[PDB]
Amino acid sequence: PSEDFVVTDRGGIVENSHRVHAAVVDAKGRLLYALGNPTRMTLARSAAAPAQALAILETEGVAGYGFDDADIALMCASHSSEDRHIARTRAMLSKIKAEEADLRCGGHPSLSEMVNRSWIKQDFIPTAVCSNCSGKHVGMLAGARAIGAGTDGYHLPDHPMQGRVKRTVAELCDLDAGDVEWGTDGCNLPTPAFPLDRLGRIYAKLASAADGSDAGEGQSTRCAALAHIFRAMARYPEMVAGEGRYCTMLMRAFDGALVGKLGADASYAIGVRASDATRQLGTDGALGISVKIEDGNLEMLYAVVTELLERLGIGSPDVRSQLASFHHPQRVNTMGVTTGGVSFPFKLRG
Amino acid sequence: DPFTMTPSEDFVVTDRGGIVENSHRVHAAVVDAKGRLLYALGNPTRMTLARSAAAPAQALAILETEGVAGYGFDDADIALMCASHSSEDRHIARTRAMLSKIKAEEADLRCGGHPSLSEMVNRSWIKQDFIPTAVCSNCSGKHVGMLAGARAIGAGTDGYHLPDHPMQGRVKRTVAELCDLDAGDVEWGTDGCNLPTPAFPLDRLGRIYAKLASAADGSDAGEGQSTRCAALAHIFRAMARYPEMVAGEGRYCTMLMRAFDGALVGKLGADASYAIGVRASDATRQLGTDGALGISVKIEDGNLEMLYAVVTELLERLGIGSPDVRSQLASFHHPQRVNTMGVTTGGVSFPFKLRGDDPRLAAVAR
Ligand SMILES: [Zn+2]
Ligand SMILES: [Zn+2]
């Protein structure tokens, strides 16, 4: 495994360096390109949300609630707690006849500094309905209600809804139950850990299912649900994160060519639909990308993800230039002087 | 394998339920009053931007500027020269009092405003829609001292912050001399407050602080000192007596220095460097030196929360502190990992190994 770093400098002098791991996999999960240790055991955190959305959508009876594509995107989200995410959360609660008091997630400072500053000015204390995970929680309420399971402990590991989540994660990873480890996330759900390349496998299967759907293929019910999830994220990326957020600007820039998702502590995953770019990389199908910054730095994650799309030729220069402020973050001091930059001395191995 | 551990494996690590979340490479040097390396983590000579952990050397360059003594700066003013302060009202007030002492105005500052280094101060700013200005800079005390030096020598206050200005020529020389380095062995960038900022091997940052602490020792014992040594001792005394000017309420540097009640001074450098100067004590003697001691730390990826955890762990391993004094730092030592429903999800640990084994075990500094 290579010593792959992203490095920041001040006047050419090394400031910080961050170890990068990355996996690029085809639709079956075969490893195509790598940085660092592409199989590093990694907490997927909220980059697992589409698999959790799959578990929700595959639960008997959930279809009768009439969740729409923006609802599903919110199930996939780490949203910024904008008023529009709160509103959709309440509208999802109304659809399943539940109440904010039924949520088992808690409030937290918004993932958007601008939202949080507006909260601070107004003395606003976030509650359960503000959780960046509030959409997947409503979905898990919905699933528990759907099969009659009882709603108080829908978040606990021994509840049938978390059993479905756990089975669904392992099946998407093509792992045995024993090879996925579990802790607890900030929103109080079980959260999985598995080799980094398998996170890319999940998103390659999202993008693969989307390709099979627009191609009129016989699809399994699971493939069709994955296709729907892809479609929902790509259509409502503002629900997946929010205004000014990397995930939203990425997906907006690519206009349905890919879906992408943040994991807390600096994981990222992308599913890329089949394209001239994927074919040039040497695969006849969809593509998956997963990334982990070893030390957890988000600013460096987004810089590295954007540099990696460039290395991979994914997008056009014009399309990627929408992400320019993430690719080379601003390094400007309190008097407007540029003090340094970011570098990418890493080499993608194939 | 505990019998093949290497500096490349010196890490501080967070976990979720025992599953590794993040890991951060640790570099540290522990040196005696002459800079002799006593203990190390990672690469103790890593070329490193000291950032505002260099501030006591800039304060020294200010105080050794002929004619500055006539302004009547007091020990709290000097502590503020050594500061990365929280932009509390008292820090802003002292900045304006220092401007008045040298007959200058806020428009003479060449630093700019920025969100407070204190979350609580920043919250009050956000409520009031307050836009911070030059006089709010965490470096304002330093900048005023540089204005004072430029005035005292007749240099001209426009440009005091630029490398070619004699005040910055004084800084650059003073820094190299404290590190015992030739000029070509210190590199220079520009910091957030718009001053030249130095980079030199990590151990030399410990060297500067060992020299602060040593000078304090000599002054307190009544030894005849050079003008420089007496000035170092004054800087030490100022930081240790007014630690709230060096940082602010709730800040690590202030809580560290209050807890130790004069036994040491310590200072943050941005992007996760730390420096501590320790007066001679039973603890330093058990560590095997007959004088003062300096410590310098760098988290490679720049994480501050991990910095404070690591510095506190390292003080415990060095036997510096009592569990009682060091217990005021307990929230820094083991950062809370509690989710939005009050459940603890994980923790920090310190898989690093202080060195200073089989002779065939190479200690390749990395
Ligand atoms: Zn969550
Ligand atoms: Zn400064």
Author numbering:
A (entry chain A): 3 to 352
B (entry chain B): -3 to 352, 358 to 367
Sentences from the paper on this structure:
The ReAV enzyme from Rhizobium etli, a representative of Class 3 L-asparaginases, is sequentially and structurally different from other known L-asparaginases. Asparaginases (EC 3.5.1.1) catalyze the hydrolysis of L-asparagine, generating L-aspartate and ammonia. ReAV is a homodimeric protein, with each subunit containing a highly specific zinc-binding site created by two cysteines, a lysine, and a water molecule. Two Ser-Lys tandems (Ser48-Lys51, Ser80-Lys263) are located in the close proximity of the metal binding site, with Ser48 hypothesized to be the catalytic nucleophile.
Substitution of Lys51 with alanine induced notable structural rearrangements within the active site region, and these changes are not strictly equivalent in the two protein chains. In chain A, the absence of Lys51 affects the position and conformational state of Lys138 in the metal coordination sphere. The side chain of Lys138 adopts two alternative conformations: one rotamer moves away from the metal cation and forms H-bonds with the Oε atom of Gln54 and the Oγ atom of Ser48, while the other rotamer maintains its typical conformation, pointing toward the Zn2+ cation. Furthermore, both the zinc cation and the coordinated water molecule are only partially present in the mutant crystal structure, with a refined occupancy of 0.5. The Ser48 side chain has a slightly different position depending on the protein chain, without the characteristic pattern of three closely spaced water molecules. In protein chain B, Ser48 retains its typical conformation, pointing toward the water molecule in the metal coordination sphere; however, the interaction with the Oγ atom of Ser80 is no longer possible. As observed in the previously described S48A mutant structure, a sulfate ion (at 0.5 occupancy) from the crystallization solution appears in the active site area, forming H-bonds with the Nη atom of Arg47, the main-chain N atoms of Gly188 and Cys189, and one or more water molecules, depending on the protein chain. Structural analysis and careful inspection of the electron density maps revealed the presence of an unintended, second mutation at position 238, where His was expected. Thus, the crystal structure of the K51A mutant discussed in this work actually corresponds to the double K51A/H238Y mutant. The K51A mutein is incapable of L-asparagine hydrolysis because the Lys51 side chain can no longer play the role of the nucleophilic activator.
